């Protein structure tokens, strides 16, 4: 696993060709954005609540989204 | 207390059979076969007793 | 029931002579007793040198007397320091009031020759 | 305090091996464990590693010496003898 901290490289990895799926783990106090690539599972944990759905729609539509719970 | 066993077929306490305990997410202790500890390079001067710096052991 | 007995051992019950099977050194190794004592006393001296209560020269000589098994515990050492701080402070007062008596007559003498070089 | 009367290092052998053998090993066993002053660095660190081999724990310099002593008397007379024939041949 690899923890992505800053926000803009996440969507840079999300648009890779080997990025198979993204998952939304919405637990309390965090919303993690797990994106499964070929070698790693990159994670983008953001503490903000509304900025999550600021990006949840920003994903490329080709990649399969998955609300995880 | 939970007594635990080996996980390979080597049942002797040889130097290639060293272990360490580990608590798994399943709430159980298991063995984890460790790697032998490395050593950093010794100086080519052949007289300094220490080992080199800046290189991984 | 075990908890009820260890609570009594804390008060010293069931630990008389007739309930001890191992030698005194086996129950309490004298090496670790000496270890506890050294680490304690050396640490005490290391705080006193740190807080300027004692100097290097007193620390070093007092260090070896700890190693020499002179002081039995922390209180006996701490009071022995007080007597060393006291007596040298007397000697510090006695050797400065006597030096003040000496250096005063030094220039009080020089003032006297100062009247000789001016009149001649 | 002085723990023994006349049995030094060889007190470890207890009552074994007889008095004379325990006495003539004392002079040797004191020597083979003594630390000598390294003639190269000056520090008292020359200590016997193995029989005949003497290592200085400070300058890390190894010296071929006697078995139980640092210098064999037979060797020091030979070093001084060679030193005379050396300057006598070349003049």
């Amino acid at each position: 696993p690899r923890k992505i901290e800053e926000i803009k490289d996440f969507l840079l990895t999300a648009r890779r060709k080997d990025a198979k799926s993204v998952k939304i783990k919405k637990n309390k106090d965090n919303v993690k954005f797990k994106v499964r690539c070929s070698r790693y599972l990159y994670t983008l944990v953001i503490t903000d609540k509304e900025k999550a759905e600021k990006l949840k729609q920003s994903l490329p539509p080709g990649l399969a989204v998955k609300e995880l719970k | 207390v939970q007594r635990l066993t080996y996980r390979r077929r080597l049942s002797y306490n040889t130097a290639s059979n060293k272990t360490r305990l580990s608590r798994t997410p399943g709430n159980r202790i298991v063995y984890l076969y460790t790697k032998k500890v490395g050593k950093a390079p010794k100086s080519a001067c052949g007289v300094c007793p220490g080992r080199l710096r800046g290189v991984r052991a | 029931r075990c908890r009820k007995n260890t609570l009594a051992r804390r008060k010293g019950r069931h630990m008389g002579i007739g309930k001890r099977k191992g030698t005194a050194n086996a129950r309490m190794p004298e090496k670790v007793t000496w270890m506890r004592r050294m680490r304690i006393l050396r640490r005490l001296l290391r705080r006193y040198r740190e807080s300027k209560k004692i100097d290097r020269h007193m620390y070093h000589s007092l260090y070896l007397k700890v190693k020499g098994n002179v002081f039995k515990n922390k209180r006996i050492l701490m009071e022995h320091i007080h007597k060393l701080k006291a007596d040298k402070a007397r000697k510090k007062l006695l050797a400065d009031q006597a030096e003040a008596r000496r250096s005063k007559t030094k220039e009080a003498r020089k003032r006297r020759e100062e009247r000789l070089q001016a009149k001649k | 305090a002085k723990r023994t009367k006349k049995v030094g290092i060889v007190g470890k052998y207890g009552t074994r091996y007889g008095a004379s053998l325990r006495k003539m090993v004392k002079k040797i066993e004191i020597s083979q464990h003594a630390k000598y002053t390294c003639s190269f660095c000056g520090k008292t660190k020359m200590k016997r590693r193995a029989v005949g081999i003497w290592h200085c724990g400070s300058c890390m310099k190894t010296v071929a010496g006697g078995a139980w002593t640092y210098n064999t008397t037979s060797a020091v007379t030979v070093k001084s003898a060679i030193r005379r024939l050396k300057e006598l041949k070349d003049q």
Binding site: - | - | - | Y17, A67, W68, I82, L85
Partner: protein
């Protein structure tokens, strides 16, 4: 192991190839690491210098002596032993040396030896005290020790 005299890894510079040849001499007492050892006919006469016997003066204390020219040393190489160059003979190129046994021998002048006595002398003076010490001594050499008469 199994030898009283210590050895000495001496590193030379091969004169024909770019290489460093290493040897195992028998350390002469007084040798120390980082010391320069000189070998050959023009080598000076100091402790730990192998040079042909014919070049040495009389009464020179040598060790690791060659019994035949070029056999890499055979004589006087136990701990603390040595041989003395008794006398030369310019013609016929021969030299008399006495051996640690007391026998005097006429060897060729060409064969060489390292100057000085063998390190590790005086080993036989310390008494083996225990049967155990004797067991460990021979366990490093060969199966010969417990000797039923």
């Amino acid at each position: 192991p199994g030898r009283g005299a210590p050895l000495a890894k001496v590193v030379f510079r091969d004169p024909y190839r770019f290489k460093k040849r290493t040897e195992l001499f028998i350390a002469a007492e007084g040798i120390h690491t980082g010391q320069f050892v000189y070998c050959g006919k023009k080598a000076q006469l100091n402790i730990g210098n192998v040079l042909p016997v014919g070049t040495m003066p009389e009464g020179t204390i040598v060790c690791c002596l060659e019994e035949k020219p070029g056999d890499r040393g055979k004589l006087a190489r136990a701990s603390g032993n040595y041989a003395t160059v008794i006398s030369h003979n310019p013609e016929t190129k021969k030299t008399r040396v006495k051996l640690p046994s007391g026998s005097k021998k006429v060897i060729s002048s060409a064969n060489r030896a390292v100057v000085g006595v063998v390190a590790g002398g005086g080993r036989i003076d310390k008494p083996i005290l225990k049967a155990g010490r004797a067991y460990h001594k021979y366990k490093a050499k060969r199966n010969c020790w417990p000797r039923v008469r």
